[PDB]
């Protein structure tokens, strides 16, 4: 009986080591491991015969639905096409933005002006909107 338990503990110890070298030593993008709320820093403390982990996590709430587009383009020049970086392009519902479209973060509802910092140039696609007036990235 003792030999069996010792082997299971050794395997469990390997799992703990992996979590120290993943869940604790770094933020992780994997989901799965760590507490289920994306991942943000986790901590570990001593427990009898083992380690006790605590995981801080992020829980989304109050979801709303919005209109969004796959990307935007220049209607005057089809090779000028953009798509958001780490976020989305949505129709604006905010009174401070004169532009019909706005950038948002993907973790939270937070519309903002579209600027070169939050977008990248991409190959053209048939689903991108054709913008015939005011786009600052590219200005032309």
């Amino acid at each position: 009986q003792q030999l069996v338990r010792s082997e299971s503990a050794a395997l469990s110890a390997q799992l703990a080591k992996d979590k120290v070298n993943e869940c604790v030593k770094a933020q992780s993008k994997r989901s799965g491991f760590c507490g289920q709320g994306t991942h943000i820093v986790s901590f570990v403390v001593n427990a009898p015969n083992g380690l006790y982990f605590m995981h801080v996590g992020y829980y989304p709430s109050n979801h709303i639905e919005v209109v969004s587009a796959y990307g935007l383009c220049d209607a005057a020049n089809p090779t000028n096409c953009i798509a958001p970086v780490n976020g989305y392009f949505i129709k604006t519902n905010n009174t401070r933005i004169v532009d019909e479209w706005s950038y948002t973060g993907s973790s939270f509802y937070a519309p903002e002006p579209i600027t070169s910092l939050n977008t990248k140039y991409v190959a053209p696609q048939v689903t991108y909107q054709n913008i015939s007036t005011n786009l600052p990235p590219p200005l032309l």
Epitope: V67, N93, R96, I97, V98, P113, T133
Partner: antibody
Framework: QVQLQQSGPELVRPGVSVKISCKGS????????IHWVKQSHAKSLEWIGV????????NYNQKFKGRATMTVDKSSSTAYMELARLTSEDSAIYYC???????????????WGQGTSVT | DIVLTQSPASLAVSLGQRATISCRAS??????????MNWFQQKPGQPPKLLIS???NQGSGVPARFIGSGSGTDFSLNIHPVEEDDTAMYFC?????????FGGGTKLEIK
């Protein structure tokens, strides 16, 4: 208790620029965009342009893109518009208006200024 | 922009009479079914004001007496109880695209 306080009327000479302003009241001024409208006749009105008061971003009616500009003075909670090269055909009742969303994704003109005029 | 027209150019009615306004667009104003149609009102000595929006026939300016209707290129405004203080100019507004132009309007007055 929202109000827009338009500046008083003036008989500006042709060939001279003219400036018009509205002071916001009863709300935080920086959370909205100002819309400007021209009333060329009692039977007709047209949009002039829009100015964000938070970012300073603008759009204009194409006919006024080389004729006018807009500025803000957030410490005074006011906004301005100025138009170059006035002519007698531009006499109008001018109105400021505040952006709103009574319906999702639909701009509404919401509150209106009492009207001012230039001739 | 999309051209807007309205009819009848003016209407005169008896007190408490039903009345309507027809408004046509040269091209549909729906984008993703949003519609973007706003109706406005004006009287002499005052600025024009919002009445209704295409998904709000009460509030957003006035009471449920002013019912907006239609989709695509056709819109209308229906008031079952027209009264003397409803004497006004009325205007269709397009919020769908810049320049954000709007119709020449119609006039309503009690006979």
């Amino acid at each position: 208790q929202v109000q827009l306080q338009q500046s008083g009327p003036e008989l500006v000479r042709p060939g001279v620029s003219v400036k018009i302003s509205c002071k916001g009241s009863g709300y935080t001024f920086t959370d909205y965009a100002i819309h400007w409208v021209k009333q060329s006749h009692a039977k007709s009105l047209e949009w002039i342009g829009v100015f964000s008061t938070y970012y300073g971003n603008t759009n204009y009616n194409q006919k006024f893109k080389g004729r006018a500009t807009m500025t803000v003075d957030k410490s005074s909670s006011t906004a301005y518009m100025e138009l170059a090269r006035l002519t007698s055909e531009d006499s109008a009742i001018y109105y400021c208006a505040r952006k709103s969303y009574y319906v999702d994704y639909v701009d509404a003109m919401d509150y209106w200024g009492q009207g001012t005029s230039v001739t | 922009d999309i051209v807007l027209t309205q009819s009848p150019a003016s209407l005169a009615v008896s007190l408490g009479q039903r009345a309507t306004i027809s408004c046509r667009a040269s091209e549909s104003v729906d984008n993703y079914g949003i519609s973007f149609m706003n109706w406005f009102q004006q009287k002499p000595g005052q600025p024009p004001k919002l009445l209704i929006s295409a998904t709000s026939n009460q509030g957003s300016g006035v009471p449920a007496r002013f019912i907006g209707s239609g989709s695509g290129t056709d819109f209308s405004l229906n008031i079952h109880p027209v009264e003397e203080d409803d004497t006004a100019m009325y205007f269709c507004q397009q919020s769908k695209e810049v320049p954000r132009t709007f119709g020449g309007g119609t006039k309503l007055e009690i006979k």
